[PDB]
Structures are given as structure tokens and as C-alpha cells.
Design a protein around this ligand. Structure first.
Ligand code: QM2
Length: 293
């Protein structure tokens, strides 16, 4: 008996054609590439079921749209173009991140195609987006590498943060939704049920840097029990073998974030001034402290 709020499914099919590129699939969401019939511009269409696990989720979807809308001025966060609705689904028409997941750069296979320069620029862009979110009292709470996309891979483009499905305000309760992330990506405070902090996102940025640089998962074990022990003890491989091609400054950056006590983690703003991320574009003329006069 529910009335629909967003633009009709008839309008969706009038304005867009879905392509044979299925981009993603979870239990209650599907992402498909679509094309504007008028312009030829590619978009991502995310189909969110309004009913999940026997719960009505339209209010939660509205909240997630409210968060995307707030980030429209931030180019590090995926842009929302339009919204449609049918009996079962709310459909987000998103900016299409043609490079796909940054997770692809963390596989041993693409190690060779990704530079130190590249990792520094991608971490800096992720920090710019997370800074913007934290200044607006938004904690993402699902910053796995599968939720950071790229505008292109050949050549390497710009990052786009996606999937605000878990996002909250600072100090909201850590309940079931929280503690059902992918186990190897959960912060220690989530395992202890502590109130939400911006510091949880900073833990996840540490994991992203670790995976981009080592091509290995810092916390995953043979089973969930082992994963949860690795997180809760912060048992991370910093061996000479794993880090032989990783700079000390990158190690320092990671080791500052992967710490048990969230209050000891640096903020996004402090991370943006980290010595690792300070780099001069060699094609620019540097103006040194000793002036010609
Ligand atoms: O899950 C969400 O909340 C949004 S997911 C999404 N949003 C915007 N643009 C793209 C491009 C994708 C993409 C996936 C895979 C690939 C190629 C097959 C590997 C290329 C692009 S997924 C996506």
C-alpha cells in the first residue's frame, strides 16, 4: 500500500538503457552500468531493496541519499545524479567510476603496474575525502578497498568513495549493523562495541595503505576466530620480507593508524601533513627559502 516518492520506473526506462556490464551484487543491492539515451553518458545504477531481512529500510536509504547529497561538492566522494523508485527498489543513478575497485591494485598480480608515487597520490586523495566527511560529522564505517573506486586504471585516475550504507554520526551506538562488516576490516573498537568514532575510518585507511604496498591482508587468518584475535591484539606482519620494498615513511604512516586505542590514531587532517605524503611535482619550479634578493 506504500506510495512512491522518487521519479517513476517508466521515466527510468525512457531516459536510460542498462548495459550487459553487471558492476556488483550484494544480498539487497545490485549495481549495473547504464547509458543516458539522450547524451550517451555512462552511469552506475544501484538498485537498493526497500525491504531487507524482514525490515523496512526506506528511511535508511533516505538517510544514505541525504549523506551523498551533502558530499556533492567533494570530488573524492561518488556523485549522485538522479534517483528513481519502483515497488521494491530505490535506484541511485551514480557517477560511473570506470576504473573499478582500488582492491584490484592490492592483488599480487598488479604490484608491478603501481608505483610509490601512485600509492602516495591515492592515499592523499582518500584522506581528502575522509577529511571532508569527518568535518561534516559523517563516519563512513565500511572503508574496505572494495568501497574505494577509481575514475580510470589506464592511466590511473582519481579516487571515488562509495557505499554509505553503514555511515553514521560520531557517538551513535555500535549495534548489529556495525559488527557485521567483512571481519578482516573491522576496527578493534567495533569488536568491543565502543561508540562510533572518526578514528574507525582512520584504522581502515591504515589497512588500505598496508594492502596497496604489501599486496597482503594485514589481519585475515585461517578462520574468523583467528581474524578477530589478529585485530584485537593488533598482530600485524611488519617483517623484513613483507616490507623489503616499502619505505620507512610508509611504514610510519601505517603504524600510526593500526593502533588498538582509537584516541591515539591521528585525524585525517594530521595524516594529510604526514612526511610520507609531502612530495614536490618535479615539473614545477620550487621556490626555496633563500630568495635571490
Ligand atoms: O556499490 C556502490 O555503492 C556503488 S558501486 C559503483 N559506483 C559507481 N561506479 C562504479 C563502477 C564500477 C565498476 C566495477 C567493475 C568494473 C570492471 C569489471 C571490473 C568497472 C567499474 S562499480 C561502481
Amino acid at each position: 500500500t506504500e506510495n512512491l516518492y522518487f521519479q517513476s520506473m517508466e521515466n527510468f526506462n525512457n531516459f536510460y538503457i542498462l548495459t550487459s556490464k553487471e558492476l556488483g551484487r550484494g544480498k539487497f543491492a545490485v549495481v549495473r552500468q547504464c547509458i543516458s539515451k539522450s547524451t550517451g553518458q555512462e552511469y552506475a545504477a544501484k538498485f537498493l531493496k526497500k525491504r531487507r531481512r524482514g525490515q523496512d529500510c526506506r528511511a535508511e536509504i533516505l538517510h544514505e541519499i541525504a549523506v551523498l547529497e551533502l558530499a556533492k561538492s567533494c570530488p573524492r566522494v561518488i556523485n549522485l545524479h538522479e534517483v528513481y523508485e519502483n515497488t521494491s527498489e530505490i535506484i541511485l543513478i551514480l557517477e560511473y567510476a570506470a576504473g573499478g575497485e582500488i582492491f584490484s591494485l592490492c592483488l599480487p598480480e598488479l604490484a608491478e603496474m603501481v608505483s610509490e608515487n601512485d600509492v602516495i597520490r591515492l592515499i592523499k586523495q582518500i584522506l581528502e575525502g575522509v577529511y571532508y566527511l569527518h568535518q561534516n560529522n559523517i563516519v563512513h564505517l565500511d572503508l574496505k578497498p572494495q568501497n574505494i573506486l577509481l575514475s580510470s586504471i589506464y592511466p590511473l585516475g582519481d579516487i571515488k568513495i562509495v557505499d554509505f550504507g553503514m555511515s553514521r554520526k560520531i557517538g551513535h551506538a555500535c549495534e548489529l549493523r556495525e559488527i557485521m562488516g567483512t571481519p578482516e576490516y573491522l576496527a578493534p573498537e567495533i569488536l568491543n562495541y565502543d561508540p562510533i568514532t572518526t578514528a574507525t575510518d582512520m584504522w581502515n585507511i591504515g589497512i588500505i595503505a598496508y594492502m596497496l604496498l604489501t599486496h597482503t591482508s594485514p589481519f585475515v587468518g585461517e578462520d574468523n576466530q583467528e581474524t578477530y584475535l589478529n585485530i584485537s591484539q593488533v598482530n600485524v606482519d611488519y617483517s623484513e620480507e613483507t616490507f623489503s620494498s616499502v619505505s620507512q615513511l610508509a611504514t610510519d604512516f601505517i603504524q600510526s593508524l593500526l593502533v588498538k586505542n582509537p584516541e591515539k590514531r591521528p585525524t585525517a587532517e594530521i595524516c594529510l601533513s604526514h612526511s610520507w605524503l609531502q612530495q614536490w611535482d618535479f615539473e614545477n619550479l620550487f621556490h626555496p627559502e633563500e630568495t635571490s634578493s
